[PDB]
């Protein structure tokens, strides 16, 4: 079982750059839309607390270089969502592939790809932190990288880069534009919440053991969910839904180890304290992650 | 931030088709008007156990093989056998063909791999050519023809096509001219790899990395000539460190402000002490599949 990213060609496709006066970031070009974050319209002046709305104004679509390698792409229209632009261009991208917007969950895995000048450098899998930051890898001239997920040919869109908080993590917004978590697109240095270990990821890497043999830590016991919850909160785990068992369907049925029998065993593990390999439970492989990989 | 980062993949997904030759099926890498692929394709199950290749090619004509490109049918007009793998020519060229080059890469070096199903990508990943010659990848049934390459200003250098899985769980392949990285054959058997050794550079790379995220504890004040590090290094089953080695290290060693052989001598603590508990960028023990460059594309 190992960490992939999905082929970025589809992704590669779109990425533009987007270019106010000196500042350039990039862009998501699909169909006659550019998306890109608000903060292209900053000067050092504005970004310790723009006011968006005001800055807008005295910016036309003639004030917008958008390109696609040098090619110039032409704006017909502007307008502000949230913490993004959205350019609209005289030129329907032909490789816009079937795409989605879609804001993820914590623990939820997808495929950042790295861009800089609108010119992919990297691809890298992340996973959505429960305190809404990404552990992602991005230098300047990043901002406007996207992250989405591909299924059956459709690209689910569902980050776009803005941040890098103090502690070195990454915070960004939806295709909409809103933030995920408590933060901000201006200058400021901005702390996140603390972080906790991702229980659906924990639980499906246990499987993924199972699967390949490694099970010395099954027990014979069973839990309620609800106690499950109340001991996982001590240990800095988050609480169990009733979705992120039905979604540990496939996994329990394969193994034929009752999602609650396995809560019972990690939360042995918890109180108590090698399974794969590794003296730590990882927590970024989601349980679609395991079931797509089998 | 630090993280495993393969190259986008797109120049090498518009170069993904499906190679059929009866009911057996295999990626292809379709570049210009050739078909690259594993010659086992020409194989039934049972031909693969025990396979006279040059027999079963002359058993073969052009109409035995069935290339696709997605769902269009490319017609095989020319087909020879370079070592491993079996060249197809076909009657169109690939549009989406990048600017490439085919290169045996060296051990110790990194190449992103696209596993690929059915002529479709499927996902990417990074890689090391271990010195023992063989990969740590992640394949499942009918991923051979997966190919791992680097990109270097819209240059694809592919480097692997992908042919076994060893019982160990790690992988085996050749380069675009079809030799077999290691000493190892395109047949069912089982086969061993020679003793792997770690990557000394990559650790010390990664050591760097480190130092550049914030993760210092391992950082002290003992010193160590190339020699006595050396000493210590094979010992512990790590490759030697070569003057050209600490050379390449020299913009790590210039941005950290850490001198080469210093980090040298916090390496020869760590492999000495362990790491007691305690973890560097995330892991428990020493990575050796970044390379100098691999780090230096992330931290600067
Ligand atoms: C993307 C901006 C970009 O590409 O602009 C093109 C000119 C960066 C992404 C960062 C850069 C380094 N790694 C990343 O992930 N975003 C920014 O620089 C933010 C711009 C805001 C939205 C206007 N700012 C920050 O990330 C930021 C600012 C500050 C602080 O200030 C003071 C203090 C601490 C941290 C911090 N982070
Ligand atoms: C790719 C072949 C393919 O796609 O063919 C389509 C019909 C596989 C890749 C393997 C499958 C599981 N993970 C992988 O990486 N290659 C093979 O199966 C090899 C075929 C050879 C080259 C003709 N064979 C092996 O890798 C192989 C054979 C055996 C053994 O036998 C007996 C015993 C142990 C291990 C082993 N590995």
């Not at 504005?46 to 003639?62: A, F």
């Not at 240990?235 to 369907?249: A, F, M, S």
């Not at 180890?257 to 809560?263: E, G, K, P, S």
Request: hydrophobic residues 35%; aromatic residues 10%; negative net charge.
């Amino acid at each position: 079982f190992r960490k992939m990213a999905f082929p970025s060609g589809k992704v590669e496709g779109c990425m533009v750059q987007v270019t106010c006066g000196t500042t350039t970031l990039n862009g998501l070009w699909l169909d006659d839309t550019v998306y890109c974050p608000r903060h292209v319209i900053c000067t050092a002046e504005d970004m310790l607390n723009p006011n968006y709305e005001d800055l807008l104004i005295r910016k036309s679509n003639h004030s917008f270089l958008v390109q696609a390698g040098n090619v110039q792409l032409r704006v017909i229209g502007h307008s502000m969502q949230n913490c993004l632009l959205r350019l609209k261009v005289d030129t329907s991208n032909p490789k816009t592939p079937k795409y989605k917007f879609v804001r993820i969950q914590p623990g939820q895995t997808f495929s950042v790809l790295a861009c800089y000048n609108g010119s992919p450098s990297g691809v890298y899998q992340c996973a959505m932190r429960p305190n809404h930051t990404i552990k992602g890898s991005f230098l300047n001239g990043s901002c406007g990288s996207v992250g989405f997920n591909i299924d059956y040919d459709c690209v689910s869109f569902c980050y776009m880069h803005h941040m890098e908080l103090p502690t070195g993590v990454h915070a960004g917004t939806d295709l909409e534009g809103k933030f995920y978590g408590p933060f901000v697109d201006r200058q400021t240095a901005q702390a996140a919440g603390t972080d906790t270990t991702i229980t659906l990821n924990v639980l499906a890497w246990l499987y993924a053991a199972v699967i390949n043999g490694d099970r010395w830590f099954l027990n014979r016991f069973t839990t309620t969910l609800n106690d499950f919850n109340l001991v996982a909160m001590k240990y800095n785990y988050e609480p169990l839904t009733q979705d992120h068992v039905d979604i540990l369907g496939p996994l329990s049925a394969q193994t034929g180890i009752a999602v609650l029998d396995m809560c019972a065993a990690l939360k042995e593990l918890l109180q108590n304290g090698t399974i794969l390999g590794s003296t730590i439970l990882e927590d970024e492989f989601t349980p679609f992650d395991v079931v797509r990989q089998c």
